[PDB]
Amino acid sequence: AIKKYKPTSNGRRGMTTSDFAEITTDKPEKSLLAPLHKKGGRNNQGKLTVRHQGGGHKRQYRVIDFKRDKDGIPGRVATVEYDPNRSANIALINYADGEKRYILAPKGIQVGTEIMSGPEADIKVGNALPLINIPVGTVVHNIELKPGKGGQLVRSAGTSAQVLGKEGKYVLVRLNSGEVRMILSACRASIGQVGNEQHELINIGKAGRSRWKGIRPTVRGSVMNPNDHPHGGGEGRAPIGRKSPMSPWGKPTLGFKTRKKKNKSDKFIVRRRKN
Amino acid sequence: MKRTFQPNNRKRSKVHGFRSRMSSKNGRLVLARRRRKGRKVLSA
RNA sequence: AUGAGUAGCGAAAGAGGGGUGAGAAUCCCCUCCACCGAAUGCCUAAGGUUUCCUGAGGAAGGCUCGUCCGCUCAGGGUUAGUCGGGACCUAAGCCGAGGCCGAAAGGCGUAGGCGAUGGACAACAGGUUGAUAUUCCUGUACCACCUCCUCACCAUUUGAGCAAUGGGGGGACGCAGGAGGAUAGGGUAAGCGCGGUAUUGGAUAUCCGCGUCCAAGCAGUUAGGCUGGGAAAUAGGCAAAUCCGUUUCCCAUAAGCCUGAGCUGUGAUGGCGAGCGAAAUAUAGUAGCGAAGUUCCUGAUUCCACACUGCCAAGAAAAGCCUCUAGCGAGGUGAGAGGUGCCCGUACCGCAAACCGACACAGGUAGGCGAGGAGAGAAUCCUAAGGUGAUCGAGAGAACUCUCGUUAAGGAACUCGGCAAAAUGACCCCGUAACUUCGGGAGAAGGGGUGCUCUGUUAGGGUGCAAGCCCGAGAGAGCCGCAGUGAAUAGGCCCAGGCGACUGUUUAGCAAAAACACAGGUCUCUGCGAAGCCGUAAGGCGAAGUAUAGGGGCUGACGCCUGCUGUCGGGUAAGUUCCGACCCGCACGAAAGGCGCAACGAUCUGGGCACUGUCUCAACGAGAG
RNA sequence: UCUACCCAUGUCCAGGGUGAAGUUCAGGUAACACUGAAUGGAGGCCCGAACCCACGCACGUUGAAAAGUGCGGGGAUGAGGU
C-alpha cells in the first residue's frame, strides 16, 4: 500500500506515498463535523511557548466515540474514511436504532461486519468488552480512570497491547512501550489492533510537504549566539563555547530523568520501559 | 519607498481615542495631566 | 556683510494670424505641426476637505513674465422604498452579571454581547443645467406592510393559522486539467444619404459617412444533477412529531424531481440615429426636422459552473435568510385604495500640482474595463475613442565634463582580472557527444532556406445551401537589389578542477559567494497522560494529540566505504592552474576517502574560437552644461 | 499606521514548450520487455511579459531623491505576491 514516485525531477526523487487503499468514500457526515482553528504555538497571553509549529492546510474535526457506551443494540460498518487530525482511519457505524457514530477503525474491518459493545458482547474484533476477558489477546484503546473518561492509551496506527494476569480489582497489562501496569478491572477496552501499519514507512520528500502539515524550520542551538542559546556564536575561531550546547532553557537533556518523584502513581507500575 | 506614516481614521481612534484612554487608570492619569496644563485638544 | 551679480532656474515641439489690454515669447480664439494609446484613456478606493460653478482682483504665492491660476474677495452648488451602511447573521479578536486567584493597584474567565475583509436582500432605458443625477423629468416595473372606507370567492376547535425547542437545506465552500453550449465584442454583401473632382488620369470593382434598442411580465430550450420511485414497521433526533434517520417488502431498468447560459414575440404607432443646420438668444447652436436600420464571417481573460475528471496536503469557515414536522390555537386567495416605505453618504481630485514624502519634488499608492494593422501574445512599431504642448528664453556652435554614431592597418599587445563595449538571438528542415542516480546531459556541438509575380478561388480540411474566411500545406516556373525574420523588439559557445540540491539572511542603507542558515534523511536521550513551556497564582500552550510528543548532534539527496613542502611533466618565445609521485602525517566505530548526474549555481580558479576604440595612437560628428 | 513572526477573511499570476510520470486501450512477450495511441502535462519543470527582488558598471554625491536613475541581471503555480 505504498507507491514510489519516478525520479522525474529533484524534489520528487525518493518521495514515497500511501495508496489509501482502505478509504471507500470521499465525503464526511455533515452531522458529526465541527470547527477547528490553528494556534501557531501561542498561549492565552499571546506569547510563543511551543516552537517549530505554525501554518499548514485547513482542517475540520470529526467527533469520535472513545467510550463505546451503546450496549446491547447492534450496529453495522458502512464506510472507512480519512481523518486529517489523527494517524489511524475512522469507520461510520449504523446502529440498529439509527444513531450513526464514528469509531477508531480496527485492523481488518470490512463493510457489512456487525459490531457489538457490552459485557456480554463476543470477542471477534472491534467489540468493546470491559476488563473481564481472557488472560491474553491484542487489546487497544484502554481507559486508565474508572470507565466514564474514555480510552486514552494505545490509540494510534499499528499500536497494540496485551492483557496478562488479574490482581483482585486490578489487571496486569503490558503497554505498547514495553512497560507493565495494573489497570482497575472496572475499566473497559476493545479487541484487536489499530490498523494502517504502513504509516511508519513514508519519506516526506521535500521541505514543502513538511510545511503543508504545520512544521516550521529549526535552527541549531549551537549556531545561535550565547544570548539566545547556552554556548555558541562563532565567526572565524574554533567553536565558541560549543561542544556542550545544553538545552535552550539552561537545563540538562542527555541521560537525564524527568519522571517526578513522589508520583503517587508508583503503586500501579511494575515494569519500566520509557518510564 | 514607503514612508512611516500611513493615515487611517479607524486605527487612530481605536488606539489614541478618548473612549480608549478612559479604560485603564494610566489613561485617566494622562487625561488629568493634559487638563492640568490647559491643552485645548484632549486626546485624539 | 563676504563669496557675487557667481552656481542654479527640477526629464518632453512648436509656428504664424487675430484678440484683449496702461503694458503680452508666456492669457483667449483659429489653422497647420508634434507626443501617449495593457496609457499620459474612464470609474473609483483609502486619504484630502470646498480645492467644484459664475463675477471681480492684481499687495504676497507661481524658481521668469502675467491682462492668467488649485492664489485673494463676493455670491451659488450635493435631492434615493430598489445604489453602499444602520432598525439582519456570524469569524479571528475584544468586553464580560455571578465566579476563581492576588500586599493593594489588578490577572483570568461562564451565561451574554460587540466586531467585515465574508453570508441574506426589491429598477431598467432615454432626456436635461454654468455647476447633481440607477436620486430630478418621461415611459414601463418590482418588493414588504395595512384595510381608513372597500369588492369577489370563501369562517371556529366542523382548525385556519404554528418556529422552534426537531430535522433538512444552506453557508457548502480545496487545488489542477480539458472538452462543449451561448453571448460582450471585432470585420463583409444588400440598403440610405453625400459627392464626379483642376497636377497625369479617373461616372467608375469612384470616394465619405450611416446602418439600432432596457428591465420586467409571456412562452417554449441546449445542458446538468438525482441515486430510482411506492407501501408497511420503528429501542434513535431531552417532550412531541405524519418530519429525519433505520429496517422489510413491491415495482423499476422510465417515469418523476429540481436547477438552469441563451432564443422567439411583447414592453416599442416608443426613442435613438448621417445630416440638414431657425430666428436672434445672448446670433451660439439650440429650437426644429430627420433617411436606411438587414444578412454573412471571426470571437473570448465573461456566463452555464468547482458543472465534469483526477490528486492528497482532505478543503473552507460559522451562524442566520429559507422550507418541513409536531407541541401551541380561526378566517384564507385574488382585485381596488394606500402609507409615501425612516436615518447616514452623494460637490471635486484619486498613476496625481488636491493623498504619503518639509517643496506645484524624475519616488510610493487595493481594485473594474482596456480597440485596429502585422503578431502566439497585455511583447514591438505605427495608429483609433480620448487626452496632451509639462510654467525661464534668445545666439554662438571655443577648451573641458556627461550621454550617443562612425572609423584606415592590427587585433587582448590593456589590466589585479576581456571590467566595459562589440558579436549571437525569429521561424521551418537535417543532425546531436563523453558521462550518468537512466529522468537527463540537449535550444548539446554543427549545416540549409525565407522577398515579389503567375499556374492558384492548388490539393485537401474546418468554415459554412452556396458565397465569405481561414491552417492553407506542398509544388512548379520567372524578376531584381549591395543586401529577404531589409525597421523595432527576442541564447555568445567549448574544455579541466575545487565547494555547496529548489529556498532564506543579505549585515532595510559598504559582504546574497565556497559567506551563512534552512531543508528530505541519519543517530542519541527523555516523557503512559505526560514530559517540557508561560505565568505570583488562577489560567493556558503541548492537544479536543496517546509512541506520540520534547531536547541534542548531524545533513545535499543518493551512494559506496560505515560507522550513526617535494620534483617532474606538460603546457607559452618566455608559467598559477593540474599531475604522480613524493609524501609528512594520519586523525579518524565514525570518518574518511575515493561518487558531478543534474542544478533552473548573479559561486571560486585555469585554458580555446568568434568579436571588438580595452590600446598601438588617436580623428571627426550629434545633443545637455 | 515603518519593520519581524503569527491568526481570520479576500484577490492576482499575457503567452508558449522538447517534452516527465503514473494510468488506460490495443499489437506483443506466460507477464515483465518493445510499439503505437490516448494521459495531457504533475512538477517546490523549462523560455518569457505584468509583479517581486536587488548581482555588475556608470552617473549623482551644498543630488530630481537623507538610498535614486540608465543600461544589463535573478524568480516568475509556489517554502509564491498582495
Author numbering:
A (entry chain C): 2 to 276
B (entry chain d): 1 to 44
Original paper wording:
YsxC (YihA in Escherichia coli) is a 22 kDa essential GTPase in Bacillus subtilis. Depletion of YsxC in cells leads to the accumulation of a 50S assembly intermediate known as the 44.5SYsxC particle. YsxC binds in the body of the 44.5S large ribosome assembly intermediate, occupying the site where uL2 binds and controls the timing in the folding of rRNA helices forming the binding site for uL2. Overall, these results suggest that YsxC serves as a placeholder factor for r-protein uL2 and provide the first example of the involvement of such a factor in the ribosome assembly process in bacteria.
To achieve this, we incubated the 44.5SYsxC particles at 37°C for 15 min in the presence of a 10-fold excess of YsxC in a buffer containing 2 mM GTP. Visualization and analysis of the maturation reaction using cryo-EM and image classification techniques revealed that the 44.5SYsxC particles evolved into five distinct classes after YsxC-GTP treatment. Importantly, the local resolution of the density representing uL2 in classes 2 to 5 was similar to other areas of the particle body. Analyzing the uL2 density from the four maps revealed that uL2 is bound to these classes in a single conformation, identical to that on the mature 50S subunit. From class 2 to class 5, we observed the progressive maturation of the uL1 stalk base (H74-75), CP, A, and P sites. The CP is still absent in classes 2 and 3 but becomes progressively more complete in classes 4 and 5. The A and P sites are fully immature in class 2, but they progressively show more densities for the rRNA helices comprising these sites in classes 3 to 5. Only the E site remains immature in all classes, likely because it also requires the influence of other assembly intermediates, such as RbgA and YphC. An important consequence of the correct accommodation of uL2 in classes 2 to 5 is that H62, H65, and H66 around the uL2 binding site become properly organized, adopting their mature conformation. Nevertheless, uL6, located below the bL12 stalk, became stabilized in class 5, representing the most mature particles in the dataset.
